[PDB]
Amino acid sequence: LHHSEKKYAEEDQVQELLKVLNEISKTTLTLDPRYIWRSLKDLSSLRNQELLNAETLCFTVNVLYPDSSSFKKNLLKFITSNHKSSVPGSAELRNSYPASFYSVNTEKKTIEVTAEINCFMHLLVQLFLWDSKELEQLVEFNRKVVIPNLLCYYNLRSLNLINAKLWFYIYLSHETLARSSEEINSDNQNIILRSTMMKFLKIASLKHDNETKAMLINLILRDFLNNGEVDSASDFISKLEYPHTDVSSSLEARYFFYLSKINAIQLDYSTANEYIIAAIRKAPHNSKSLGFLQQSNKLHCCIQLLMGDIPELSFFHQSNMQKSLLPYYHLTKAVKLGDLKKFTSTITKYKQLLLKDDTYQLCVRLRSNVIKTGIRIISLTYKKISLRDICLKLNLDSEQTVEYMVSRAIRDGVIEAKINHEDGFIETTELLNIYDSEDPQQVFDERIKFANQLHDEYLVSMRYPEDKKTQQNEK
Amino acid sequence: MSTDVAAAQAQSKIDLTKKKNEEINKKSLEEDDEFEDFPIDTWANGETIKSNAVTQTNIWEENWDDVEVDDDFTNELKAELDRYKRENQ
Amino acid sequence: TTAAPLLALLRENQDSVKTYALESINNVVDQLWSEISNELPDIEALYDDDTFSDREMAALIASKVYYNLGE
Amino acid sequence: LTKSLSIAFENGDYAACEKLLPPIKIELIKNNLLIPDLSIQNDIYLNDLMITKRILEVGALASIQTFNFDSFENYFNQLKPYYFSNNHKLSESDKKSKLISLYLLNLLSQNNTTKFHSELQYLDKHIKNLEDDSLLSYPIKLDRWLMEGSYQKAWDLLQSGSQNISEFDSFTDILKSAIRDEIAKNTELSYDFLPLSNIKALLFFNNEKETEKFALERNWPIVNSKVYFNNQSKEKADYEDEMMHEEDQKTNIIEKAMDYAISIEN
């Protein structure tokens, strides 16, 4: 039974990796060798879990380790010891061939290329403990494995690719503990965590490895959102250094979603709104980004209101879910009529939800924009309307009270109007015909420049598949 | 799912065993599903019918005065009589 | 946590705190550099006065910041 | 010494506080050398930290009165993550509450409304959710009325805030001056001209010497007894045309075609 099944499972696992180690070491082609690991990770874990998870322990011994072994063993003990079930000759075979790891490198130990193999192994254990959930010490154990692998195996571009997944889970495990509760461990370790990833980022610049740089960036940015120390997130995005050469489409969404949040709290809602539409365009979706995509819709609606021009009632019906967008449909409506009471009732009601989504801060400003967008329907509908008539409609104190609200909005550009005090009415300014002005020449300029860029790009990408195939083993 | 729907996101960048792991990384860094935060938390779901083609998530197009009640039958009825009162005063 | 304690020490007008600011900053020049860049002008100011012995320190620190950005 | 600073604040003599600051800042170094500055916390650490923070608390209020904004901003940056960490580890004072609230008003008058909105996020997780109000409503409400665009509501709260003390009296004067510069910007686009009695009512002033001084700062002749907002608009446009940053933003039609032509022939 056990002795056979684990035997065959350990030796298969080593062989699949050894090939993608070889694959990456032959020129540069970053994306494709990587993709092999992403499809593999998902499958390797499920196979290890059936037939007892000490199938990972055979693999763990069949790598040269710095201190992975102790951490893995502890789990086996806990669900009742499985170290007599996975035993040598079936958990330790270097053989005399490489397909359970090369014999010549293992004995010599200074030529060994175990590195990337080793990185894929660690990841498997961290994932199982991540599912189960363990915190505090779980962060410490992960953190203790990961740093040694930078330091016993020499760094390459190739090394940074696969240890880019290692970084994600340390960083992630610390943020979830941080939002659970503050703790003596969390305050102190936050300092190390923030700094060490910033230290790899310039080294990634030196490497010229674009995949690596993006993943470190996204992780720093996220911590600032979680604890609200966005006074930093602002300084972080003064600089730009995010690449787009070897950066995946899935990642490009990631940058733009968070960037959209920072722009909203410098009170520039123009380029916030730009990057949230943008974020969806880069983003793929299937079912595995379903949580992210739901929040993408929610954030867009908050931004559109901040600018002072309502989204439609149809806008949420024509979204293909409204099944968590039910609070922000209510928000479009409440700003829209110019009604203050409706805004109070919903914000209290959905207080826990707003707090979680980092949309509660924007709703202190959106209390303010109830009246500011209240004006926007009335001045639009009626070209000329007295000061006194608008006091009717929005139940405002004084005629003078009207003038103040509208004057702010038109510096921010929301109304596009002018108040006349000698004839006692507000006259909504025209847009005219802009066909006889030089405005369409600006729009075209955007279009022309993007299209020229596509013709040049395609010619480069004729060549790229041809290289990939030539390298590839016969078909 | 807002301006730029879920269909264009599956047809442009094709769902592959290659891409799913990356998408998992998007969801996890944000932290959890927020599709499933609302029906557990609130014990409610979205909009429901009121006459059909007015509300409820559908491929049916809707009105922009959907939320506004139909008292319009009354208002035209009152408009005639009130108009005779003013003219014939 | 941010570099906000580190930046504050430079701005303080007592000469003993200005010397002290660079002793702390010097350690974390390579680790935080996207939060120590507000008061990089405070560090270029100290070079100009010859009444500081921390001309040396001010340049040493200053050069390194530019490379971390990737200039 | 650290102690003398604290009793000088309660005596009510802030000139006294002010003149103990130059020795105080040298011992504040010694206090920093005691602690490892948040990288390991102990219980002996908090007895050393009480000596550290004390300086910052007293020092910070006293700077508001004495017009030492750089030092108030300095003492705030040091002090703040101490309170934030562990939900308080103690690291707590009654004086804590006054500093958060006065610090929000400080940004607002400088027109770091950008920073105001950032700074808020931090404090909401910190104490707004957990200890409710530290007199945080006072800044947040002014912000709302500027963004709403009603300057009556906001001016009214400043008038009342100088009939109250929490040291809001020391920041109302500043936020009076700050509001006045903001409405001039709005009112260029709104009006083409106004009576001198109307500009007087709107930008809030108690003399016509103030209203015309304010007008001629914004380069609007006060001739005919009417203002003339359009006059400043002309001169801003000329300033821009002299620079070479405005000429290529427009992009001329000779430039657009030639740059269009060389991409194709490349």
Coordinates of N, CA and C in Angstrom, one line a residue, chain C:
Chain C
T1 N 6.1 50.4 10.2 CA 5.9 51.8 10.5 C 6.7 52.7 9.6
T2 N 6.3 53.9 9.4 CA 6.8 54.9 8.6 C 8.1 55.4 9.1
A3 N 8.8 56.4 8.4 CA 10.0 57.1 8.7 C 9.8 58.3 9.4
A4 N 8.5 58.6 9.9 CA 8.1 59.9 10.4 C 8.8 60.4 11.6
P5 N 9.3 59.5 12.5 CA 10.1 60.0 13.6 C 11.5 60.5 13.2
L6 N 12.0 59.9 12.1 CA 13.4 60.1 11.6 C 13.5 61.5 11.0
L7 N 12.4 61.9 10.3 CA 12.4 63.2 9.5 C 12.3 64.4 10.4
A8 N 11.5 64.2 11.5 CA 11.2 65.2 12.5 C 12.4 65.8 13.2
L9 N 13.4 64.9 13.5 CA 14.7 65.2 14.2 C 15.6 66.2 13.5
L10 N 15.6 66.1 12.1 CA 16.3 67.0 11.3 C 15.8 68.4 11.4
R11 N 14.5 68.6 11.4 CA 13.8 70.0 11.3 C 14.0 70.8 12.5
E12 N 14.1 70.0 13.7 CA 14.4 70.6 14.9 C 15.7 71.5 14.9
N13 N 15.6 72.8 15.3 CA 16.4 73.9 15.1 C 17.6 73.9 16.0
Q14 N 17.6 73.2 17.2 CA 18.7 72.9 18.1 C 19.7 71.9 17.2
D15 N 21.0 72.3 17.3 CA 22.1 71.7 16.5 C 22.4 70.4 16.9
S16 N 22.3 70.0 18.2 CA 22.5 68.7 18.7 C 21.5 67.6 18.1
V17 N 20.2 68.0 17.8 CA 19.2 67.1 17.2 C 19.4 66.8 15.8
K18 N 20.0 67.8 15.0 CA 20.4 67.7 13.6 C 21.4 66.7 13.3
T19 N 22.5 66.6 14.2 CA 23.6 65.7 14.2 C 23.0 64.3 14.5
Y20 N 22.1 64.1 15.5 CA 21.5 63.0 16.0 C 20.6 62.3 14.9
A21 N 20.0 63.2 14.1 CA 19.0 62.8 13.0 C 19.7 61.9 12.0
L22 N 20.8 62.4 11.6 CA 21.6 61.6 10.6 C 22.1 60.3 11.1
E23 N 22.5 60.1 12.4 CA 23.0 58.9 13.1 C 21.9 57.8 12.9
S24 N 20.6 58.2 13.1 CA 19.5 57.2 12.9 C 19.2 56.8 11.5
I25 N 19.1 57.7 10.6 CA 18.8 57.7 9.2 C 19.7 56.9 8.4
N26 N 21.0 56.9 8.8 CA 22.2 56.3 8.2 C 22.0 54.8 8.2
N27 N 21.4 54.2 9.2 CA 21.2 52.8 9.3 C 20.2 52.3 8.3
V28 N 19.1 53.1 8.1 CA 18.0 52.7 7.3 C 17.9 53.5 6.0
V29 N 19.1 53.9 5.5 CA 19.1 54.6 4.3 C 18.7 53.8 3.1
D30 N 19.0 52.4 3.1 CA 18.8 51.5 2.0 C 17.5 50.8 2.2
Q31 N 16.9 50.9 3.5 CA 15.7 50.0 3.8 C 14.5 50.8 3.6
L32 N 14.5 52.2 3.9 CA 13.4 53.1 3.7 C 14.1 54.3 3.0
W33 N 13.5 54.6 1.9 CA 14.0 55.6 0.9 C 12.9 56.1 0.1
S34 N 11.6 55.7 0.4 CA 10.4 56.2 -0.2 C 9.6 56.8 0.8
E35 N 10.2 57.2 1.9 CA 9.6 57.8 3.1 C 10.8 58.6 3.8
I36 N 12.0 58.4 3.3 CA 13.0 59.4 3.7 C 13.4 60.0 2.3
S37 N 12.6 61.0 1.9 CA 13.0 61.7 0.7 C 12.4 63.1 0.7
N38 N 11.6 63.4 1.8 CA 10.8 64.6 2.1 C 11.8 65.6 2.6
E39 N 12.7 65.2 3.5 CA 13.7 66.0 4.2 C 15.1 65.6 3.7
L40 N 15.2 65.1 2.5 CA 16.5 65.0 1.8 C 17.0 66.4 1.6
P41 N 16.3 67.5 1.3 CA 16.8 68.9 1.3 C 17.4 69.4 2.6
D42 N 17.0 68.7 3.8 CA 17.4 69.1 5.1 C 18.8 68.6 5.1
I43 N 19.1 67.4 4.5 CA 20.4 66.7 4.5 C 21.4 67.5 3.6
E44 N 21.0 68.1 2.5 CA 21.8 68.9 1.6 C 22.1 70.3 2.2
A45 N 21.2 70.8 3.0 CA 21.5 72.0 3.8 C 22.6 72.0 4.7
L46 N 22.8 70.9 5.4 CA 23.9 70.6 6.5 C 25.2 70.6 6.0
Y47 N 25.4 70.2 4.7 CA 26.7 70.2 3.8 C 27.2 71.7 3.7
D48 N 26.3 72.6 3.4 CA 26.6 74.1 3.1 C 27.2 74.8 4.2
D49 N 26.8 74.4 5.5 CA 27.4 75.1 6.6 C 28.6 74.3 7.0
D50 N 29.8 75.1 7.3 CA 31.1 74.4 7.5 C 31.2 74.3 8.9
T51 N 30.2 74.7 9.7 CA 30.2 74.7 11.2 C 29.8 73.4 11.7
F52 N 29.4 72.5 10.8 CA 29.0 71.1 11.0 C 30.2 70.4 10.6
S53 N 30.4 69.2 11.3 CA 31.4 68.2 11.0 C 30.7 67.1 10.2
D54 N 29.4 67.3 10.0 CA 28.5 66.3 9.4 C 28.2 66.6 8.0
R55 N 29.1 67.4 7.4 CA 29.3 67.5 6.0 C 29.6 66.2 5.3
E56 N 30.3 65.3 5.9 CA 30.8 64.1 5.4 C 29.6 63.2 5.4
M57 N 28.9 63.1 6.5 CA 27.8 62.3 6.8 C 26.7 62.7 5.8
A58 N 26.5 64.0 5.6 CA 25.4 64.5 4.8 C 25.6 64.1 3.3
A59 N 26.8 64.1 2.8 CA 27.0 63.6 1.4 C 26.8 62.1 1.3
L60 N 27.4 61.4 2.3 CA 27.4 59.9 2.3 C 26.1 59.3 2.2
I61 N 25.1 59.8 3.0 CA 23.7 59.5 3.0 C 23.0 59.9 1.8
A62 N 23.3 61.1 1.3 CA 22.7 61.7 0.2 C 22.8 61.1 -1.2
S63 N 24.0 60.6 -1.5 CA 24.3 59.9 -2.7 C 23.5 58.6 -2.8
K64 N 23.4 57.9 -1.7 CA 22.9 56.5 -1.6 C 21.4 56.5 -2.0
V65 N 20.6 57.6 -1.6 CA 19.2 57.9 -1.8 C 18.8 57.9 -3.3
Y66 N 19.7 58.6 -4.1 CA 19.6 58.7 -5.5 C 19.6 57.4 -6.2
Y67 N 20.6 56.5 -5.9 CA 20.7 55.2 -6.4 C 19.5 54.3 -5.9
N68 N 19.0 54.4 -4.7 CA 17.9 53.6 -4.3 C 16.6 53.7 -5.2
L69 N 16.3 55.0 -5.5 CA 15.3 55.4 -6.6 C 15.7 54.8 -8.0
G70 N 17.0 54.8 -8.3 CA 17.5 54.1 -9.5 C 18.0 55.2 -10.5
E71 N 18.3 56.3 -9.9 CA 19.0 57.4 -10.6 C 20.5 57.2 -10.3

